[PDB]
Amino acid sequence: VGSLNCIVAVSQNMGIGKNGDLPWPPLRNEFRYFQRMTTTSSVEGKQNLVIMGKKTWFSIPEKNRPLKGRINLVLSRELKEPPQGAHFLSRSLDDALKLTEQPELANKVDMVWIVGGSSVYKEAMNHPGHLKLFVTRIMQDFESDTFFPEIDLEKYKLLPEYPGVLSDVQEEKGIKYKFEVYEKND
Numbered sequence: 629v630g631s632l633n634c635i636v637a638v639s640q641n642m643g644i645g646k647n648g649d650l651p652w653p654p655l656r657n658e659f660r661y662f663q664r665m666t667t668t669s670s671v672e673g674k675q676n677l678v679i680m681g682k683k684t685w686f687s688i689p690e691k692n693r694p695l696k697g698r699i700n701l702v703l704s705r706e707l708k709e710p711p712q713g714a715h716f717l718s719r720s721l722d723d724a725l726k727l728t729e730q731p732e733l734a735n736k737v738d739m740v741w742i743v744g745g746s747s748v749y750k751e752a753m754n755h756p757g758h759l760k761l762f763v764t765r766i767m768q769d770f771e772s773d774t775f776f777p778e779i780d781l782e783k784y785k786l787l788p789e790y791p792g793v794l795s796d797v798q799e800e801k802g803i804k805y806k807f808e809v810y811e812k813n814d
């Protein structure tokens with residue numbers, strides 16, 4: 629199995645969600661960036677795995693689930709089987725990561741991408757080890773009811789460039805945003 633990574637888009641006031649949806653209007657190139665980054669595997673014969681909480685799964689429109697070309701794993705302690713369209717179900721983040729190591733999957737998974745939401749991000753970010761955060765900074769405040777955990781900049785180094793990631797300011801629907809990549813190793 630290769631790297632562990634989180635990916636997220638976040639407003640200036642650290643918001644990621646409101647009422648089961650994004651706080652901002654759809655940003656279609658932002659979403660194409662998310663798709664490209666999480667689908668692209670730097671290893672032949674393998675695909676990437678995406679891990680998400682239950683609410684995130686149901687927050688993605690039906691037409692776009694499962695996220696295609698990736699193994700989709702949902703986290704829940706209530707569900708008895710993966711949701712309609714998903715591939716795997718685990719009861720903790722530790723369980724999900726062990727599973728990638730099992731022979732069912734050890735040979736098939738390249739990168740792992742945590743794609744939401746708050747609890748899953750927090751636990752990954754505070755777990756010792758090598759971890760990258762792909763963060764899109766939406767450069768406006770948006771009313772939100774769900775927030776991204778604090779990034780400790782003592783541990784997470786902002787990378788000065790990263791292959792495949794544009795460094796300049798993007799804009800769609802009059803909303804400016806920029807891409808960042810952070811890395812810790814502890």
Ligand SMILES: NC(=O)C1=CN([C@@H]2O[C@H](COP(=O)(O)OP(=O)(O)OC[C@H]3O[C@@H](n4cnc5c(N)ncnc54)[C@@H](OP(=O)(O)O)[C@@H]3O)[C@@H](O)[C@H]2O)C=CC1
Pocket residue numbers: 635636637638643644645646647648649650651680681682683684687702703704705706707718719720721743744745746747748774
């Ligand atoms: N802007 C962005 O980049 C993104 C934003 N979002 C936003 O996130 C919002 C919802 O996310 P959030 O409220 O944080 O939900 P979570 O990310 O915490 O998802 C958890 C859901 O699955 C189960 N679950 C929760 N935590 C775990 C866990 N640690 N292990 C296994 N299963 C778990 C359920 O909890 P239980 O254990 O009780 O079963 C819960 O319904 C959405 O409205 C969406 O808009 C989502 C993705 C990306």
Ligand SMILES: CCOC(=O)CCCCOc1ccc(OC)cc1Cc1cnc2nc(N)nc(N)c2c1C
Pocket residue numbers: 635636637644645646648649650658659662684687688689691692742743744763764
């Ligand atoms: C193809 C036809 O066009 C369509 O129909 C497009 C539907 C798009 C809806 O996608 C939603 C919606 C609500 C939602 O959560 C509340 C999540 C997602 C998926 C998404 C989108 N952008 C992201 N950005 C970052 N940076 N990081 C992420 N993790 C990320 C994720 C996970």
